[PDB]
Amino acid sequence: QDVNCTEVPVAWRVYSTGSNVFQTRAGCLIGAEHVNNSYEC
Amino acid sequence: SKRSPIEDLLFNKVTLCAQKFNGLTVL
Ligand SMILES: *[C@@H]1O[C@H](CO)[C@@H](O)[C@H](O)[C@H]1NC(C)=O
């Protein structure tokens, strides 16, 4: 939450960097891919 | 903006910092 995540890996490890990283208003999410479609919530 | 003239007038009157400190967050 509320963290620009070019610098998360500063503090079981795949979820710290690498793979695909996404930027949302609340923060950013690691471990999910951002599709271009729209669905029910 | 996708608002209406009345909605636009309303949103321009609500107008009256506090970014983050001492564990104060706004979701
Ligand atoms: C996040 O950081 C990168 C590089 O550190 C910068 O290019 C980007 O504009 C920043 N984004 C925000 C929302 O601060």
From Swiss-Prot, chain A:
Record note on what altering residue 2 to G does: In strain: Alpha/B.1.1.7, Beta/B.1.351, Gamma/P.1, Delta/B.1.617.2, Epsilon/B.1.427/B.1.429, Eta/B.1.525, Theta/P.3, Iota/B.1.526, Kappa/B.1.617.1, Lambda/C.37, B.1.1.318, Zeta/P.2, Mu/B.1.621, 20A.EU1, 20A.EU2, Omicron/BA.1, Omicron/BA.2, Omicron/BA.2.12.1, Omicron/BA.2.75, Omicron/BA.4, Omicron/BA.5, Omicron/BQ.1.1, Omicron/XBB.1.5, Omicron/EG.5.1; common variant; binds to hACE2 more efficiently; produces more infectious particles when cultured in primary human epithelial cells; does not significantly shift SARS-CoV-2 neutralization properties
Disulfide bonds: 5-28
Glycan-bearing residues: 4, 36
Entry function: Attaches the virion to the cell membrane by interacting with host receptor, initiating the infection. The major receptor is host ACE2. When S2/S2' has been cleaved, binding to the receptor triggers direct fusion at the cell membrane. When S2/S2' has not been cleaved, binding to the receptor results in internalization of the virus by endocytosis using host TFRC and GRM2 and leading to fusion of the virion membrane with the host endosomal membrane. Alternatively, may use NRP1/NRP2 and integrin as entry receptors.
Assembly information from the UniProt record: Binds to host ACE2. RBD also interacts with the N-linked glycan on 'Asn-90' of ACE2. Cleavage of S generates a polybasic C-terminal sequence on S1 that binds to host Neuropilin-1 (NRP1) and Neuropilin-2 (NRP2) receptors. Interacts with host integrin alpha-5/beta-1 (ITGA5:ITGB1) and with ACE2 in complex with integrin alpha-5/beta-1 (ITGA5:ITGB1). May interact via cytoplasmic c-terminus with M protein. May interact (via N-terminus) with host bilirubin and biliverdin, thereby preventing antibody binding to the SARS-CoV-2 spike NTD via an allosteric mechanism.
Protein name: Spike protein S1
Curated annotation (Swiss-Prot), chain B:
Site positions per UniProt: Cleavage: 3-4
Function: Subunit of the fusion protein that is processed upon entry into the host cell. Mediates fusion of the virion and cellular membranes by functioning as a class I viral fusion protein. Contains a viral fusion peptide that is unmasked after S2 cleavage. This cleavage can occur at the cell membrane by host TMPRSS2 or during endocytosis by host CSTL. In either case, this triggers an extensive and irreversible conformational change that leads to fusion of the viral envelope with the cellular cytoplasmic membrane, releasing viral genomic RNA into the host cell cytoplasm.
Name of this protein: Spike protein S2'
Gene responsible for this protein: S
Part of the full-length chain shown: 813 to 861 of 1273
